[PDB]
Amino acid sequence: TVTVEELPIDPANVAAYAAVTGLRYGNQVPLTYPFALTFPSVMSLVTGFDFPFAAMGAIHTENHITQYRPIAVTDAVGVRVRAENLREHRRGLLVDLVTNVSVGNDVAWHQVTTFLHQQRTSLSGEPKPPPQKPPPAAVLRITPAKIRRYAAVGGDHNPIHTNPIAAKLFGFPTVIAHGMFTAAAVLANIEARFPDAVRYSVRFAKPVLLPATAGLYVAEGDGGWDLTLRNMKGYPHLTATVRGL
Ligand SMILES: [Cl-]
């Protein structure tokens, strides 16, 4: 467990984040923003010192955010993080990083982030699953330079997103986008209609090799939104759901 009593929010950092992700800057932080805000506290738990990087080569596989109420740019926040549920995967060791962000003594925003830390495991002899696979609602175009900018703003400088040598050392043929860049970028416009209490579940699949041109599909429903971002192969970079609580 790591604990941070009172963490102020810099409105400039929110603005800069909203600008880079293409999201709206206003009185409420964007739904995904407390990922960036808390991340250096998250990695101080694994490292013991403040460290603003996911472990080099780590792969973000899943993220579940439950927002009970919006967090104001003017709020200061209580932060508590914990690590749990180590388990083996074919391509490494998954761990869950569970974050509680409070305003007053109430929990406004909760997150389960699962990172895959690459390494051989006893499941590594075992075959590659297959995937689970028209004109899109929008097209995301993502450059190395947008992702160098995202690194500065979103609390994670893991150099597999910015330096090709680092990427290559960890199995990637070019630099790749951060998972949470893309998780934030897909919310553009759509976010205007979110209720204040909302859950956002993201599953990450094919790495977003840069430069990337990627088609975004959005089905709106009574419950909320189903999102899929893909590369036209046409396999998924992510699939996700937004649901009003
Ligand atoms: Cl990532």
Q: How many helices (H) and strands (E) does the chain have?
A: 5, 10
Query: By the 8 A CB rule, do 36 and 154 touch?
Result: yes
The data reach a resolution, in angstroms, of: 2.3
> How far apart, in whole angstroms, are the C-alpha atoms of residue 86 and residue 141?
35
Residue 106 Cα to ligand 1 midpoint, Å, equals 29
Q: Quick check: 154 and 180 in contact, CB under 8 A?
A: yes
Closest CA to 70 of 42, 37, 32, 124: 32
CA distance 207 to 216: 15
d(CA 178, CA 150): 8
Domain boundaries, the chain: 1-245
User: Is residue 38 a contact partner of residue 87, using CB atoms and an 8 Å limit?
Assistant: no
- 105: CA distance to ligand 1 center in Å? 31
Report H helices in the chain: 11-21, 33-47, 144-153, 164-169, 179-185
Q: How far apart are CA 54 and CA 9, in angstroms?
A: 21
Cα 222 to ligand 1 centroid, rounded to whole Å: 31
Which residue's entry shows tokens 């192969």? 233
Interval between CA 113 and ligand 1 midpoint (Å): 11
Nearest CA to 19 out of 200, 213, 149, 191 is that of 149
Q: How far is the CA of 104 from the centre of ligand 1 (A)?
A: 30
Report the alpha-carbon distance of residue 190 to residue 98 in Å, rounded.
Answer: 26
Q: Measure 202 CA to ligand 1 centroid, in angstroms.
A: 12
Pair 61, 183: CB distance under 8 Å? no
Alpha carbon distance 41, 156 (integer Å): 11
**Alpha carbon distances (Å) from 136 to 21, 119, 208, 231:** 19, 36, 17, 11
Question: Would you state the structure tokens that stand for residue 161, as one six-digit string?
Answer: 């997103």
Tell me the CA–centroid distance for residue 203 and ligand 1, in Å: 12
**Method by which the coordinates were obtained:** X-ray
The SS3 assignment for 31 reads: coil
Could you tell me the strand order of the sheet in which 106-118 lies? Answer: 2-8, 76-89, 92-103, 106-118, 59-67, 198-204, 236-244, 224-230, 212-220, 138-142
Q: Cα(204)–Cα(94) distance, rounded to whole angstroms?
A: 13
Q: How many CB atoms lie within 10 A of CB 14?
A: 22
Tokens at 153, concatenated = 């703003």
Which residues, other chains included, contact 42 with Cβ-Cβ below 8 Å and sequence gap of 6+? 2, 81, 97, 99, 113
**How far is the centre of ligand 1, averaged over its atoms, from the C-alpha of 59 (Å)?**
5
Which residues neighbour ligand 1 (ion) by CB within 5 Å?
A: 60, 178-179
- Select the CATH number that applies to the domain covering 1-245 from these four: 3.40.50.1700, 3.10.20.30, 3.10.129.10, 3.40.50.170: 3.10.129.10
